[PDB]
Amino acid sequence: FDRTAKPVPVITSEVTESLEDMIRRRIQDSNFDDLQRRTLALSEELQKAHSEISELYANLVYKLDVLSSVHFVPKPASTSLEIRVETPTISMEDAQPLYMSNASSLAPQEI
Amino acid sequence: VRKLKHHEQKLLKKVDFLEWKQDQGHRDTQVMRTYHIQNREDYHKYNRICGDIRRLANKLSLLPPTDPFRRKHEQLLLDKLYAMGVLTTKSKISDLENKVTVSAICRRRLPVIMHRLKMAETIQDAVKFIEQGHVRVGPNLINDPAYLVTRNMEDYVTWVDNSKIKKTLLRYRNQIDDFDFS
Amino acid sequence: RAWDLIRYRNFRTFTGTERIQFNCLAVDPSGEVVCAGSLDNFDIHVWSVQTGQLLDALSGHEGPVSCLSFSQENSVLASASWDKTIRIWSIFGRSQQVEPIEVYSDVLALSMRPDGKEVAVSTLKGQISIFNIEDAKQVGNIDCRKDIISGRFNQDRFTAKNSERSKFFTTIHYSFDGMAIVAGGNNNSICLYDVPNEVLLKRFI
Amino acid sequence: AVPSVQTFGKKKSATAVAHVKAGKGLIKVNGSPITLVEPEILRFKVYEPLLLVGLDKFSNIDIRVRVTGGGHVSQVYAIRQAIAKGLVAYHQKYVDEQSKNELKKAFTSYDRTLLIADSRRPEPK
Amino acid sequence: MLRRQARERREYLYRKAQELQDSQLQQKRQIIKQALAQGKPLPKELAEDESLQKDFRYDQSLKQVDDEYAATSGIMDPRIIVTTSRDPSTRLSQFAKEIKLLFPNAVRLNRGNYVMPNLVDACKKSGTTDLVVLHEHRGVPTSLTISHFPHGPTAQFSLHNVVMRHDIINAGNQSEVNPHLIFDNFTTALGKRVVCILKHLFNAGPKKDSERVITFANRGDFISVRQHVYVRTREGVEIAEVGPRFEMRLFELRLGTLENKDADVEWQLRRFIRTANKKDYL
Amino acid sequence: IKDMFSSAMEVARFEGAQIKTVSGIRGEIKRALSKPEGHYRAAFEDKILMSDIVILRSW
């Protein structure tokens, strides 16, 4: 007659010796699958193109967020360096005849 | 004016009082009807923004293609213009000049969204329910018909609670509960 | 963002994973943990103060987190959803257990007594309820829909009596005595409810 | 017309549709008086919204309650829920407000399950 | 949440069905880029388009895991639930614990008088990556489904040759550390679906010298999975087996969760077909 | 399906066999039913009738 399905394969020791000798080949060569983690001027005319076009985009974001009733979807990434200057930190606050902080802005560890 | 004759015609080949090239096909009226927007200057208050999308699209097209600014910068923008929901898909970068239309931004209006979510029957009738004060976004009810609604914020429009129009809905399913005083 | 008041500077700028808005905030009294809540995500993000990583994304709300606040006594925190449920969290020390307390409508702007044993809520029906923490039950509730003055705007089409704009309270803060609540919303009026006697004291336009 | 108020009551899979209208003081469950509820031990589990607040406040009202679904017990938790909700939502509508906050503070101190459905939604650990 | 979780599915479909009509435009923009790079001739229907010509000036700046797993892929660890069918036999209630041990971040919640809606719907709420439910015949476990929760796919697996770990000996207890994986003999595009739907059940980025490795081997259309530990001798690697032996076979693949029962069927094992026994991954 | 095979052992010599019907639907015969001696469970591709006559081709 005629069948209709290759049945359940019988696990002989011959199958496993074909299988565990595969695993030794992929461990010892260390080529195996795994779910790797996801990490994380130029020209005088081109920079002036870049500087115009970011001044226009920040004008656009101010308009579009006002349409959207401020509910703003944040920017994905942001990496920046900044430079702080040691001042006696009455001089970082607004013009007013008092103060709350007397020491310098740079920490003693940071100097 | 008169359905002027054939010899009147050739001298007045160009005059027309209703339709001008300045007037630009009356596109501004033609989409004010389809979305039922209240004040006239509302169109060109969008069409200044919807033009300003394309002017930023154009100069960002004039940068060279393998520039990690330019590749970063419109995909930065299509994130926002899809979150706000003016454009259907995020894939094409040339939706940003071709699919950004006023009728795209004029259907994230609140009364259109109340007609999309099948709240009111028609689109004029949704303006009738907003102006009377039956609809709300989260805590506070909204009263300007022309409230833009973010695709994220599009989840949260409901009928305002204890209203006479959210009471009638619950009577149809025979599921009122006056401990809520619905 | 964290800030210093001795030096006027950020310590660290805590951020999420997928860049979410943050409405509200809760700080561990022993200043180790800063929790924040959204409208976009409805997951309570949790940052450590030292390491700017997020320790954990506390989740389990339907609808956004309105407010978040910590006990100053035993440092359990309690969230305030818009799925009409206060959910009180216990996040310190091998417990990680959760207790939801259902309320009637959307809650917003929670606040906790300095006892650390009661939680005062402001729902959207107007009514302010006062729950216990060690039990899930409530002590009592005080009714705030009537004694709220509401304005009719200029562009309105409804009477000021039957608009549902402003008859709830978008904030509450217990007094440090633990005996009085001051509430204030998008309305014209501020209130001073007494907590045991359950009656307002004076209403401020 | 006729002043009525409809409230629901829900335990495991049992609903309870309690119409409350101004009347003479009869209280029916499925076209049968409330003194004939089935489990006969839990009959005082449905006399709780009668006897907590005081039986005087039922002198002018009708309580027509009809229930489906549930079992023997989990219907008795539905008729005690919809009578408490149907009483405390008639005093905010057609009787005085200060009655309602007296009731809602009475059912609360006794058992809060009378008012809001204790939904035992799952938890994964 | 319930309305939000529904409407992101609707937009994910319209973002997917847009790509099928824009796959044709995706193909033609390869031709424009190459002919601009190297090669003069340019085909007829792409010649007469002025639409696609102006369209290309923006389109020149454009550029793999599955689309459901794409947002999380390496960033967030999965948290998974192994749960059992209904009133389980005490053999399979052991066997759900070997599935709870074979993955990391796996908790075992005994199921009884839960419905599949309120166990799904109370899991999207609490937030889990996916759901592992088992079935059995007379103690021998037979079936197994993995179903990614935020409207993600599901994969009903039939598993034939099982050897539970509690049968063997009191040899000890498993390593439970993050495993390396081994995927063998996955060539088909449907085979890559089963890769990317199984792989994300493990915590991302295993160490280079973690000691237990979980092989998923596909000889003869039966995905055969074994659990191994290894140490490396002076010459060869020497391994030994702990944990379950499976044969396994997927037989239907919905695009919804296992709740849904009317979602779109990506793949379905046809048994009753003239060429059923012929092909592989069919 | 009844009275095609005499014993429950006779079915076991024939399981996995591509059974077809008059109506034209296919299937396989899978397990020998025990408590009567002859019958067996068989999964078709669609709902077989009562009025229908299964035939297993053989040589």
H or E element that contains E237: strand E237-245
**Best CA proximity match to C168, nearest among C128, C119, C120:** C128
Contact E271 F25 (CB under 8 A): no
Contact A101 C21 (CB under 8 A): no
CA–CA distance, B83 with B79 (Å, rounded to integer) = 6
Interchain contact E105–D (C-beta under 8 A): no
Residue E116's SS3 state is helix
**Cβ-contact E203, E176 below 8 angstroms:** no
Contact D97 C146 (CB under 8 A): yes
Interchain contact A47–B (C-beta under 8 A): no
H or E element that contains A46: helix A44-67
> Taking CB atoms and an 8 Å cutoff, what residues of chain E touch A28?
232, 236-237
Taking the CA atoms of residue F32, residue F34, residue F35 and residue F41 in that order, the dihedral angle to the nearest 10 degrees is -30
Residue E133's SS3 state is strand
**Best CA proximity match to E178, nearest among E45, E77, E256:** E77
What would the two tokens of residue B148 be?
A: 């833009």
CA–CA distance, B133 with C156 (Å, rounded to integer) = 8
**Best CA proximity match to E244, nearest among E152, E121, E125, E162:** E162
Sign, CA dihedral D105-D111-D115-D117, equals: positive
Query: Any residues with CB less than 8 A from the CB of D66 and at least 6 apart, and which?
Result: D16, D17, D29, D30, D31
Give the CATH number of domain D1-125.
3.30.230.10
Interchain contact E131–D (C-beta under 8 A): no
**Cβ-contact C17, C37 below 8 angstroms:** no
CA distance F20 to chain E (A): 10
CA–CA distance, E59 with E49 (Å, rounded to integer) = 15
- Name E250's bridge partners: E157
Q: Per this entry, what is the length of chain A?
A: 111
Query: Which among A71, A75, A76 has CB closest to B150?
Result: A71
Residue C174's SS3 state is strand
H or E element that contains C191: strand C190-194
Q: What is the largest CA-CA distance in chain B?
A: 78
Contact C98 D123 (CB under 8 A): yes
CA–CA distance, C111 with C66 (Å, rounded to integer) = 11
**Best CA proximity match to C135, nearest among C86, C199, C82, C194:** C86
Do the bridges between strand C138-142 and strand E265-268 make them parallel or antiparallel, or are there none, so unpaired?
unpaired
The radius of gyration of chain B from alpha carbons, rounded to an integer in Å, stands at: 23
CA distance C52 to chain D (A): 27
Interface of A with F in 3-22 (CB under 8 A): 3-5, 7
**Cβ-contact E243, E260 below 8 angstroms:** no
**Cβ-contact A103, A86 below 8 angstroms:** no
**Cβ-contact E105, E122 below 8 angstroms:** no
**Cβ-contact C21, C29 below 8 angstroms:** no
The residue type found at B147 is Y
- Resolution, given in Å to one decimal, reads 3.8
CA–CA distance, D109 with E125 (Å, rounded to integer) = 31
CA distance D85 to chain B (A): 6
> Taking CB atoms and an 8 Å cutoff, what residues of chain A touch B153?
69, 71
**Best CA proximity match to D17, nearest among D4, D26, D3, D1:** D4
Query: Any residues with CB less than 8 A from the CB of E248 and at least 6 apart, and which?
Result: E144, E157, E158, E159, E160, E222, E223, E224, E225
Domain boundaries, chain D: 1-125
* CA dist list (Å): C129 to B177, C18, C103, C112, E194: 21, 35, 9, 12, 51
A and D in touch (3+ CB pairs within 8 angstroms): no
What would the two tokens of residue E159 be?
A: 């598993």
**Which experiment gave this structure?**
cryo-EM
Query: Any residues with CB less than 8 A from the CB of C94 and at least 6 apart, and which?
Result: none
Q: What is the largest CA-CA distance in chain C?
A: 56
CA–CA distance, A63 with A43 (Å, rounded to integer) = 30
Is residue D34 packed enough to be buried (19+ CB in 10 Å), middle (13-18) or exposed (0-12)? Answer: middle
CA angle B117–B119–B120, rounded 5-degree value: 125
The helices-and-strands tally (H runs, E runs) of chain C is: 0, 15
Half-sphere exposure of F23 (CA within 13 A, CB side): 14
CA–CA distance, F27 with F4 (Å, rounded to integer) = 15
Interchain contact D85–B (C-beta under 8 A): yes
E and B in touch (3+ CB pairs within 8 angstroms): yes
Do the bridges between strand E154-158 and strand E249-254 make them parallel or antiparallel, or are there none, so unpaired?
antiparallel
Residue pointed to by tokens 């060869």 = E236
> Number of Cβ pairs closer than 8 Å across C and E?
18
**Best CA proximity match to E239, nearest among A11, A26, A17, A23:** A23
CA–CA distance, D21 with D60 (Å, rounded to integer) = 9
**Cβ-contact F1, F14 below 8 angstroms:** no
What is the phi/psi pair of residue B135, to 5°?
-120, 155
> Taking CB atoms and an 8 Å cutoff, what residues of chain C touch D121?
100
The residue type found at E8 is E
CA–CA distance, B47 with E136 (Å, rounded to integer) = 64
Which chains pack against A, by 3+ Cβ pairs within 8 A? B, C, E, F
B48, B52, B81: best to mutate for the A interface, most A CBs within 10 A: B52
